[PDB]
Design a protein around this motif. Structure first.
Motif, mmCIF file in Angstrom:
data_model
loop_
_atom_site.group_PDB
_atom_site.id
_atom_site.type_symbol
_atom_site.label_atom_id
_atom_site.label_comp_id
_atom_site.label_asym_id
_atom_site.label_seq_id
_atom_site.Cartn_x
_atom_site.Cartn_y
_atom_site.Cartn_z
ATOM 1 N N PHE A 4 0.815 -1.180 0.000
ATOM 2 C CA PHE A 4 0.000 0.000 0.000
ATOM 3 C C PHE A 4 0.860 1.246 0.000
ATOM 4 O O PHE A 4 1.948 1.264 0.581
ATOM 5 N N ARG A 5 0.388 2.256 -0.671
ATOM 6 C CA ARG A 5 1.086 3.510 -0.768
ATOM 7 C C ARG A 5 0.536 4.485 0.255
ATOM 8 O O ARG A 5 -0.654 4.822 0.228
ATOM 9 N N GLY A 10 2.520 15.049 0.975
ATOM 10 C CA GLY A 10 3.033 15.035 -0.372
ATOM 11 C C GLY A 10 4.017 13.910 -0.613
ATOM 12 O O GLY A 10 4.395 13.652 -1.758
ATOM 13 N N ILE A 11 4.426 13.237 0.443
ATOM 14 C CA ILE A 11 5.385 12.150 0.336
ATOM 15 C C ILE A 11 4.676 10.812 0.317
ATOM 16 O O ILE A 11 4.022 10.432 1.284
ATOM 17 N N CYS A 12 4.794 10.130 -0.782
ATOM 18 C CA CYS A 12 4.203 8.835 -0.963
ATOM 19 C C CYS A 12 5.268 7.766 -0.929
ATOM 20 O O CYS A 12 6.324 7.903 -1.575
ATOM 21 N N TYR A 13 5.027 6.741 -0.160
ATOM 22 C CA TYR A 13 5.910 5.608 -0.070
ATOM 23 C C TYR A 13 5.078 4.341 0.001
ATOM 24 O O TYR A 13 3.966 4.357 0.539
ATOM 25 N N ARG A 14 5.580 3.275 -0.542
ATOM 26 C CA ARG A 14 4.865 2.023 -0.553
ATOM 27 C C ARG A 14 5.405 1.084 0.517
ATOM 28 O O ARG A 14 6.618 0.875 0.616
#
Length: 18
Positions: A4-5, A10-14
């Motif tokens: 899941f992301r 503003g920072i997206c990480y999976r």
């Protein structure tokens, strides 16, 4: 297996849990 992301400020990480 579940990947899941997470986006915050503003920072997206999976992440993947199995």
């Amino acid at each position: 297996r579940w990947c899941f992301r997470v986006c915050y400020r503003g920072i997206c990480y999976r992440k993947c849990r199995g």
